């Protein structure tokens, strides 16, 4: 039960931009060897790796563990794989933390990647990670769930007449964060006006698809002094899983948790509340301790996560976003690197993208820096809350 610290974290820049020239093996080496350089450590010093991608159906490449190890040239160091939608990296990070905390491995590398251009149309493939017999094979995409989830939230929480404004305000705030973050895909672009964003596609809340690989180096606490001046520790993390089927959100007898709201729906993610409550208790903090956070953003799905994370009351996330509360001077800065709207989004690499910005935030290195930040939390979901990962990081 020893402490684990993050000595380094890096990912390929512009994750919302495709990297059609390099193979996924080239892409993975790039992010890892840049992170190893930051930690002043040799690649041979890694004793094992926990990596993650969507599944063998994209690049038609299965059992990827040994190929990753050989690609990095750390053979015979093992590589542990995780295939869990957008939380593939978040689960790979949690796996690596358990590998170092167990004392079986002293230095581990945890990352995720998504090389979507290897598939002709990657958007059709995505649905293969659900209750495929009753949704994928029926023509139900993952984007459908987020579209319906956004609809139920606005409709049952009295946001009629303000739906376009809330989505555009969140999307605009993501552009503002991403304009000055050099690793963001929307970096350097002008900020569209609020009225322009409401007329754009998905009212400005559509994410930027792309490709990226990222990784973070975890080391035992006593070994951390050799590799980093300012280490970031892991207070606590939780991972939870419920049925992939979208219908079970409203009716979930399998899920067992206390205090869950009676009116569970797509707008009120029951699994997301459970995962947050487990992680907070395990990390020894309440929601009032978070100085900066990172959530999965797509249409109104960001609003649902803020309420499940305890940032604001049920039905209040929209008004919170409208009041500039997730701005840098707002009550809680949210997705300070630009999020999936501005930074970009690769499903396999999403978890590391969250840790990296939180990692930079707790070391004062973020481009939009929360003054005196001590606690950083990453909220991530796979599928539609079928997976859910909440990770808590502190700087001291």
């Amino acid at each position: 039960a020893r402490r684990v610290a993050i000595v380094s974290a890096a990912y390929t820049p512009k994750p919302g931009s495709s990297r059609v020239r390099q193979t996924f093996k080239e892409m993975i080496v790039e992010s890892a060897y840049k992170a190893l350089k930051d930690a002043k450590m040799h690649p041979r010093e890694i004793q094992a790796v926990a990596y993650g991608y969507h599944g063998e159906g994209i690049s038609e490449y299965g059992g990827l563990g040994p190929t990753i190890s050989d690609a990095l040239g750390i053979s015979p160091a093992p590589t542990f794989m995780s295939t869990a939608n957008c939380t593939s990296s978040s689960v790979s990070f949690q796996m690596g933390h358990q590998m170092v905390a167990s004392g079986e491995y002293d230095i581990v590398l945890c990352g995720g990647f998504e090389k979507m251009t290897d598939h002709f149309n990657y958007a059709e493939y995505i649905g293969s990670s659900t209750e495929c017999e009753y949704d994928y094979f029926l023509g139900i995409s993952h984007t459908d769930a987020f579209a319906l989830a956004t609809a139920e939230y606005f409709q049952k929480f009295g946001y009629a007449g303000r739906e376009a404004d809330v989505l555009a305000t969140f999307g605009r705030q993501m552009r503002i964060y991403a304009q000055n973050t050099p690793t963001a895909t929307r970096y350097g672009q002008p900020i569209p006006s609020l009225e322009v964003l409401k007329n754009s596609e998905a009212c400005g809340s559509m994410l930027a698809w792309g490709e990226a690989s990222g990784c973070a180096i975890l080391v035992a606490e006593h070994l951390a002094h050799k590799y980093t001046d300012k280490p970031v520790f892991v207070r606590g993390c939780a991972y939870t899983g419920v049925s992939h089927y979208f219908g079970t959100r409203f009716h979930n007898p399998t899920l067992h948790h206390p205090g869950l709201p009676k009116d569970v729906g797509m707008a009120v993610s029951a699994n997301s509340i459970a995962c947050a409550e487990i992680a907070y208790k395990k990390a020894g903090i309440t929601a009032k301790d978070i100085d900066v956070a990172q959530v999965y953003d797509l249409l109104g799905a960001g609003l649902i996560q803020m309420e499940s994370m305890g940032i604001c009351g049920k039905g209040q996330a929209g008004d919170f976003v409208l009041e500039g509360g997730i701005a840098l001077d707002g009550q809680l800065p949210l997705n300070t690197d630009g999020g999936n709207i501005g930074r970009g989004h690769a499903s396999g690499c999403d978890g590391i993208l969250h840790i990296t910005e939180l990692f930079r935030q707790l070391r004062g290195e973020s481009d939009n820096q929360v003054k005196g930040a001590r606690i950083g939390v990453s909220q991530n979901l796979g599928g539609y809350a079928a997976h859910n990962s909440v990770i808590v990081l502190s700087n001291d």
Partner: protein, 145 residues
């Protein structure tokens, strides 16, 4: 075609998958527990609430109302076999017995009639063709008006 050269395909579906799911897709069959009478859909082997192995097939209510709906008009997200109909009306259907089914609404005679909470009934329709050339049939929902 004219050159019968086999083309590479990683995954070919066996008839067994849909054969075991004829009850679930054709007749909207879920599962009910004998101890606590809790109902689920899709079918499951283990009860969730009391965690009993004793679970039996259950015919879900074929009538229901629309809990939430969202049109699918984006052509980038058009799936093979479903690109002919634009737009597809995705909706979560709250059946009469309380269960919620994720499906789509078809045969919208009156656009004004379709709204949140409108009554619908289950129908059987054609879906994407199987990888083994067999026609796939499964449920959809139409407005019960």
């Amino acid at each position: 075609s004219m050159y019968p050269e086999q083309i590479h395909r990683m995954t070919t579906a066996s008839m067994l998958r849909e054969w075991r799911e004829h009850g679930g897709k054709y007749r909207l069959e879920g599962s009910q527990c004998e101890e606590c009478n809790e109902i689920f859909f899709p079918r499951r082997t283990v009860c969730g609430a009391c965690n009993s192995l004793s679970v039996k097939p259950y015919r879900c209510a074929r009538s229901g109302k629309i809990e939430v709906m969202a049109p699918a008009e984006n052509p980038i997200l058009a799936a093979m076999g479903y690109g002919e109909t634009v737009p597809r009306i995705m909706a979560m259907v709250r059946l009469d017995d309380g269960l919620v089914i994720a499906s789509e609404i078809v045969d919208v005679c009156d656009q004004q009639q379709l709204k949140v909470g409108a009554p619908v009934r289950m129908v059987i329709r054609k879906h994407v063709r199987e990888s083994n050339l067999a026609w796939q049939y499964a449920y959809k929902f139409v407005l019960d008006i």
